[PDB]
Amino acid sequence: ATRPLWQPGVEAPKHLDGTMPGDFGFDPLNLGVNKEALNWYRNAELQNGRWAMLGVAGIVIPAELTRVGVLNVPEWAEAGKVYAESENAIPFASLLMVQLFLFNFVEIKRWEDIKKPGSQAEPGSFLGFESGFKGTGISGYPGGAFNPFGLGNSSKEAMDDLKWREIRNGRLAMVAFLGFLSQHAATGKGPLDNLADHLADPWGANFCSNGVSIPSALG
Amino acid sequence: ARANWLPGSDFPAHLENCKLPGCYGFDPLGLGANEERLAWFAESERVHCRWAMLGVAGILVQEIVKPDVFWYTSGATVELPFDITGLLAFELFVMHWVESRRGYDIKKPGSMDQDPIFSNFKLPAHEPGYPGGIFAPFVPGSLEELKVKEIKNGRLAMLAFIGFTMAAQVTGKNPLAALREHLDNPLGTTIFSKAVVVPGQAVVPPCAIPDTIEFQGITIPAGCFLHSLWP
Amino acid sequence: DVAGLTPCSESKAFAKRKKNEVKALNKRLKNYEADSAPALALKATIARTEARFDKYAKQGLLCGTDGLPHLIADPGLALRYGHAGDVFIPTIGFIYFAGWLGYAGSKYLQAVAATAKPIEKEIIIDVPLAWKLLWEGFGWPLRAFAEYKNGSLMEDDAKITVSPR
Amino acid sequence: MKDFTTYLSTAPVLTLLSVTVVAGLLIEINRFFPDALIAAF
Amino acid sequence: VRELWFPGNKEVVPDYLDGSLVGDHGFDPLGLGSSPEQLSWNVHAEIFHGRLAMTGVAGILLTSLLHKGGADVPEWFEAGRVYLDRNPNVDFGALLFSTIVMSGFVEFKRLNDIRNPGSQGSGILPEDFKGVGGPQGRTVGGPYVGGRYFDPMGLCRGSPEQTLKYKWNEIRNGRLAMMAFLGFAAQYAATGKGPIDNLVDHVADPFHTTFVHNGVSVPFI
Amino acid sequence: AGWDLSAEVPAHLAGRKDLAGNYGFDPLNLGKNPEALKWYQQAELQNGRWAMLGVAGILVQELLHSTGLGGKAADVYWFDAGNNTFWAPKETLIAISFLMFNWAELNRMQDYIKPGSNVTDPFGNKIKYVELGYPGFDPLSFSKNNFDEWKLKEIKNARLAMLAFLGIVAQHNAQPGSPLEQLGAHLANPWKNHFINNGVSPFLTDN
Numbered sequence A: 001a002t003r004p005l006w007q008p009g010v011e012a013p014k015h016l017d018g019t020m021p022g023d024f025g026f027d028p029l030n031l032g033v034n035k036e037a038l039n040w041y042r043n044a045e046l047q048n049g050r051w052a053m054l055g056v057a058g059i060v061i062p063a064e065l066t067r068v069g070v071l072n073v074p075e076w077a078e079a080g081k082v083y084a085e086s087e088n089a090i091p092f093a094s095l096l097m098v099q100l101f102l103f104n105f106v107e108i109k110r111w112e113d114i115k116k117p118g119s120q121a122e123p124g125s126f127l128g129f130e131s132g133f134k135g136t137g138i139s140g141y142p143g144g145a146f147n148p149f150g151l152g153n154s155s156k157e158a159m160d161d162l163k164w165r166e167i168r169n170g171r172l173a174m175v176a177f178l179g180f181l182s183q184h185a186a187t188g189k190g191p192l193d194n195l196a197d198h199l200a201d202p203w204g205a206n207f208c209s210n211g212v213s214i215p216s217a218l219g
Numbered sequence B: 001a002r003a004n005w006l007p008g009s010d011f012p013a014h015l016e017n018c019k020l021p022g023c024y025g026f027d028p029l030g031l032g033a034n035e036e037r038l039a040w041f042a043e044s045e046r047v048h049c050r051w052a053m054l055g056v057a058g059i060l061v062q063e064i065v066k067p068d069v070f071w072y073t074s075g076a077t078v079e080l081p082f083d084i085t086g087l088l089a090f091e092l093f094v095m096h097w098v099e100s101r102r103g104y105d106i107k108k109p110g111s112m113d114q115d116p117i118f119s120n121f122k123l124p125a126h127e128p129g130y131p132g133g134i135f136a137p138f139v140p141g142s143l144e145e146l147k148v149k150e151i152k153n154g155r156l157a158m159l160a161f162i163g164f165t166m167a168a169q170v171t172g173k174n175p176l177a178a179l180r181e182h183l184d185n186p187l188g189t190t191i192f193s194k195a196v197v198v199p200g201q202a203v204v205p206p207c208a209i210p211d212t213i214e215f216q217g218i219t220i221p222a223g224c225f226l227h228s229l230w231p
Numbered sequence C: 001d002v003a004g005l006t007p008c009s010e011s012k013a014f015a016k017r018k019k020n021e022v023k024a025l026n027k028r029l030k031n032y033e034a035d036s037a038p039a040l041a042l043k044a045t046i047a048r049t050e051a052r053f054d055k056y057a058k059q060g061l062l063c064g065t066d067g068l069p070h071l072i073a074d075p076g077l078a079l080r081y082g083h084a085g086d087v088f089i090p091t092i093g094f095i096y097f098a099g100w101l102g103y104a105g106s107k108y109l110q111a112v113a114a115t116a117k118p119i120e121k122e123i124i125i126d127v128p129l130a131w132k133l134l135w136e137g138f139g140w141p142l143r144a145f146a147e148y149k150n151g152s153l154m155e156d157d158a159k160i161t162v163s164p165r
Numbered sequence D: 001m002k003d004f005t006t007y008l009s010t011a012p013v014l015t016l017l018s019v020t021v022v023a024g025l026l027i028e029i030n031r032f033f034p035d036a037l038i039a040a041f
Numbered sequence E: 001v002r003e004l005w006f007p008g009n010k011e012v013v014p015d016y017l018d019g020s021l022v023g024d025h026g027f028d029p030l031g032l033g034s035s036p037e038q039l040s041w042n043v044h045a046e047i048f049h050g051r052l053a054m055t056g057v058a059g060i061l062l063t064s065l066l067h068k069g070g071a072d073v074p075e076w077f078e079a080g081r082v083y084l085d086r087n088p089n090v091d092f093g094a095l096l097f098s099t100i101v102m103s104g105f106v107e108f109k110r111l112n113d114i115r116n117p118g119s120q121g122s123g124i125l126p127e128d129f130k131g132v133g134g135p136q137g138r139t140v141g142g143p144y145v146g147g148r149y150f151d152p153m154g155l156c157r158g159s160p161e162q163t164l165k166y167k168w169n170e171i172r173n174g175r176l177a178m179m180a181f182l183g184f185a186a187q188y189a190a191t192g193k194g195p196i197d198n199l200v201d202h203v204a205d206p207f208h209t210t211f212v213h214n215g216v217s218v219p220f221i
Numbered sequence F: 001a002g003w004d005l006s007a008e009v010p011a012h013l014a015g016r017k018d019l020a021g022n023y024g025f026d027p028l029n030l031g032k033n034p035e036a037l038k039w040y041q042q043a044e045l046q047n048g049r050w051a052m053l054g055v056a057g058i059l060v061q062e063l064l065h066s067t068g069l070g071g072k073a074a075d076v077y078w079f080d081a082g083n084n085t086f087w088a089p090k091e092t093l094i095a096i097s098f099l100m101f102n103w104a105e106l107n108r109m110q111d112y113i114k115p116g117s118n119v120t121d122p123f124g125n126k127i128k129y130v131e132l133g134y135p136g137f138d139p140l141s142f143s144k145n146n147f148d149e150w151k152l153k154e155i156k157n158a159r160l161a162m163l164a165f166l167g168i169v170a171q172h173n174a175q176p177g178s179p180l181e182q183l184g185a186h187l188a189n190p191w192k193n194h195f196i197n198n199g200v201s202p203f204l205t206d207n
């Protein structure tokens, strides 16, 4: 209720209240008015945040190591093409189809979990592994096989805090990936290169001087 | 009371029943209307009084002992036994400690009255802005008259320091040097004799301080205080 | 080449058209001074014409036998030959903006329909409410899909008036 | 003042202002980005 | 009752202007503040405009005085271009974006205070940023924000008479500064010189240096 | 209030007298959550003890490298230990360290999850448990008396060692030579050599 809001002084919408992690009453477009739609958007936000976290990690950590000298990998925008010209390189179409085939199975199963959390725990569904496919009651947080170390299982408040940390990190990584895309499209350089170039001359090296963000027609 | 900064006037409401030393009912802007602000300003005035007294006395003694050294440019023309960087750092650290203790003592009376190293020694109870104890081992006379003397001398010292800096920026000489110059020609050495403005013309005395001063390897501004606003 | 069309970059008719237009503009310009207002206006028109032709040739547009750009309106055909910006992308852009305006109007009408006097709200628009709904209409695809999957985007046929056959 | 703002919120006034704003925005888009035959992004 | 912007004539004085507001003289011939919320918004805008005009006029006057004395301080009508010239490493768009962002943060804080009088005096801010109210009988928020940061000297804390006197001083000086900025713009557009330049040229030669001799106000002359 | 006579104890540290070196220092309120404070106490003990061992090792190695006592192995900077050659390469030593540390750290984590549980070795040997962060490895029985004073000494020395290691790393990244050499270079004047003139910390001064 009285938790911090995105815009101090503005009352949070009634459709948001304060139970979902990362609930800051931010919904100027009123996209989550419907309960079913809000649940689907919550699951989508969790999935997008986790994938963005994995991608941003795989883009920043290797780049940071490469800058130091240990572990030499190409820039993220050229990583796909670098592997294409390899000797025993798998065809792009075949690789994409294999990835999509595996993702079809896992994503469809997760989809059924979203409609009904205890769906995948149906006895006899698998070869005895369905017992570990029962969620925690909320779609998007499946214990059992996942979460093997049992982090946050000490109490309900401990799990809530970890959920907030996860949602904030996911949102930060999502915004970071969008920034990576825009930065590479505007400037054909890596994220670390952009950061180093900006600190050298912040007033002369930023989005206002890349020649893409601000159209040249206006000036 | 009968001692008023404007005889025949009336003390302001907030300055009535004012027990502060040297309180002559002077507050046209009402800066001391608030009680808390009045105490804070009293502490600020006392510290300014003491600092100005020390500065004026030091400048006068330096000029008497060393008349060939300009007090205005002494910061860059004295030849320091140590280094300017180390000296500034040491002064900043010790000043931070003492000033923080004093300010916190003002915010909370008896919070900063105990010796942190020697637990047996403690400053006795006192009034804000007047430590005492080890700070006042000799008191020649009553505390009230001495307090009034301190406040009056401090105010005079502040005015003296402002006069010193203005005379140095206008004449470029030391305090006693400017006084001697004024004594040799009172009708020609006053501010009214060097500056005058009329609807059509304005005479502004030239700056006696260089535009910039070179210290070590860098350059320091050090010019005139609002020369464009000079009469 | 898609349907016997030649790229405007290698089209002779396209270059001839540009040359003729610039020639006509210069012929008109010859009857003026060098720094007068009509001369500057004609020079600006010439520059704009040259820039337009160069941009059309550089953008990869397809020109026919007549030397004029032609648009490919077919997904797949335009996607594999690099012509998605001819009709595909403009289709997406339109659909989005059109749906935005339509959804904003629908939401405003449904919101004022619950007021005690809706006709007056229709002739005298509520500027703050209209502004808020116009802003909310930008998320029209998500809202429309949610309402459709929710069943609230439609009215029951048994509740809509109909003619006596 | 309330009546004046209510009059400015009428269907004809709002329609003309909206059309004028949209036309002005389109005119300036075409002034700074002229001859946009295709969506070249 | 109180002094009016036009002696006598109580018909032109609006009813909503009862004299409770600071600087109220019954001036509103066009009825731009007839509505209550419109009047509150206009009060906020007027005080903000006055403070902004005072700051701008003070800066312009000081820069013009420094320019006359020989300092490397350009005129107000060319200060931006001059600064951009001496600093070729500062992008204009970057400076504009930074100014807009910082001003947007503070302006959003003030805006939320306008929407909710006492909503910014908590969270990431102490109770000092809650406001003291004043206009429309409010006791919180408004253009008058007390506290220990927007009033460190505490001039409005203690004796309501002093507070009223200072408020009147502020509004009168703000209106005067607004008119002064308008005059600065008109004088620069007519003569092409700064404020101090116009003042000294006029004092040097009173007659022959009026608005009629600038060649812009009176075209045929 | 212990760390600042003008400050107030952040409440969550007022009723905690069993914590070593409790001076009410937590301006960021990081230890407000009891579980967070419980984890932070163990983290502080681990970091402090490791910092004490590391700082002592760096200081002893540099002392032997400067004065001259250790062989060719000691005659080298602490950050240049990679140039030396030992019985096993860097990769082998790193892998061995990872395995041994995995074993020891997992034992410590098991104890943290349930204090007093993992206290018996595979051969049946047992020890007496005395608080979480203090397993009881006291072969000299020094904790029989004045346990609070001893742990206070440990926490203060640990914090000092942590600060010392941070300073050593910063000096190495800003000044050349070993920590003892930096101390000597300072003591040489010492009004000129003091991070202000190093040309790295101020940055704004002489680029």
Ligand code: CLA
Residues within 6 Å of the ligand: E005, E017, E021, E022, E023, E024, E025, E026, E027, E028, E031, E032, E033, E034, E039, E042, E043, E044, E045, E046, E049, E175, E176, E178, E179
């Ligand atoms: C933008 C600055 C500004 C604003 C927002 C206000 C706002 C207000 N004034 Mg104020 N005033 C101003 C400037 C301003 N004033 C200046 C510069 C003067 C000195 C001449 C005065 C002198 C004055 C007096 C004597 C009184 C007020 C009063 C009021 C209040 C009631 C009037 C009202 O509701 O109409 C709102 C006003 C506006 C919405 C501004 C409209 C501006 C129009 C639309 C533009 C035309 C202005 C100008 C003629 C053209 C020049 C522009 C061009 C050269 C670029 C109100 C809160 C009365 C009061 O009760 O005080 C509380 C009152 O007695 N004002």
Ligand SMILES: CC(/C=C/C=C(C)/C=C/[C@@]12O[C@]1(C)C[C@@H](O)CC2(C)C)=C\C=C\C=C(C)\C=C\C=C(C)\C=C\[C@@]12O[C@]1(C)C[C@@H](O)CC2(C)C
Residues within 6 Å of the ligand: E027, E028, E029, E030, E031, E032, E049, E050, E052, E053, E055, E056, E057, E059, E060, E075, E076, E077, E078, E079, E080, E177, E178, E179, E181, E182
């Ligand atoms: C805010 C303002 C000026 C601010 C200026 C600034 C910040 C200047 C900034 C800078 O200069 C510096 C410092 C340095 C330079 O190098 C750069 C710039 C950037 C240029 C003036 C407002 C100026 C505002 C003015 C003059 C307003 C006048 C309004 C009037 C007279 C209205 C009267 C009536 O509205 C009533 C009250 C009642 C109605 O019913 C009837 C009528 C008659 C309509």
Ligand SMILES: CC1=C[C@H](O)CC(C)(C)[C@H]1/C=C/C(C)=C/C=C/C(C)=C/C=C/C=C(C)/C=C/C=C(C)/C=C/C1=C(C)C[C@H](O)CC1(C)C
Residues within 6 Å of the ligand: A026, A027, A028, A029, A030, A031, A048, A049, A051, A052, A053, A054, A055, A056, A058, A059, A075, A076, A077, A079, A080, A174, A175, A177, A178
């Ligand atoms: C909330 C709201 C509500 C209201 O009402 C309205 C509004 C305002 C609208 C809103 C907002 C929204 C937003 C902001 C959104 C965004 C999102 C994002 C950004 C996402 C991303 C997301 C993102 C993501 C997933 C990403 C991911 C990534 C990845 C995987 C990566 C990958 C990779 C790698 C590793 C490497 C290589 O070499 C390359 C690649 C291949 C590339």
Ligand SMILES: CC1=C[C@H](O)CC(C)(C)[C@H]1/C=C/C(C)=C/C=C/C(C)=C/C=C/C=C(C)/C=C/C=C(C)/C=C/C1=C(C)C[C@H](O)CC1(C)C
Residues within 6 Å of the ligand: B026, B027, B028, B029, B030, B031, B048, B049, B051, B052, B053, B054, B055, B056, B058, B059, B062, B071, B074, B075, B158, B159, B161, B162
């Ligand atoms: C009360 C009131 C109230 C009402 O109501 C209003 C009004 C009017 C506002 C008011 C008044 C006010 C005033 C008058 C003020 C002033 C002050 C001052 C002057 C200060 C100074 C002050 C001053 C000061 C401190 C000073 C100090 C000084 C010094 C330290 C010095 C030092 C030095 C020396 C030794 C030597 C060397 O070689 C140099 C130097 C370094 C330089």
Ligand SMILES: CC1=C[C@H](O)CC(C)(C)[C@H]1/C=C/C(C)=C/C=C/C(C)=C/C=C/C=C(C)/C=C/C=C(C)/C=C/C1=C(C)C[C@H](O)CC1(C)C
Residues within 6 Å of the ligand: F025, F026, F027, F028, F029, F030, F047, F048, F050, F051, F053, F054, F055, F057, F058, F077, F078, F079, F081, F162, F163, F165, F166
């Ligand atoms: C309390 C609080 C609370 C509030 O509220 C807030 C705040 C303020 C944030 C806070 C504070 C904090 C802090 C200060 C922290 C810090 C820490 C540290 C420094 C650690 C270290 C730590 C450190 C450490 C572990 C270290 C260790 C070391 C070592 C092992 C070493 C090793 C080594 C050696 C021997 C030798 C060779 O040749 C090299 C090497 C191999 C390298």
Ligand SMILES: CCCCCCCCCCCCO[C@@H]1O[C@H](CO)[C@@H](O[C@H]2O[C@H](CO)[C@@H](O)[C@H](O)[C@H]2O)[C@H](O)[C@H]1O
Residues within 6 Å of the ligand: E220
């Ligand atoms: C009752 C009717 C209204 C009465 C008041 C009308 C006054 C309004 C402005 C009148 C001025 C405009 O008309 C203006 O007349 C003056 C004066 O002759 C002309 O000025 C001309 O004659 C004057 C002197 O006679 C010369 O110094 C000048 O060089 C020449 O240009 C202007 O070229 C014309 O623009």
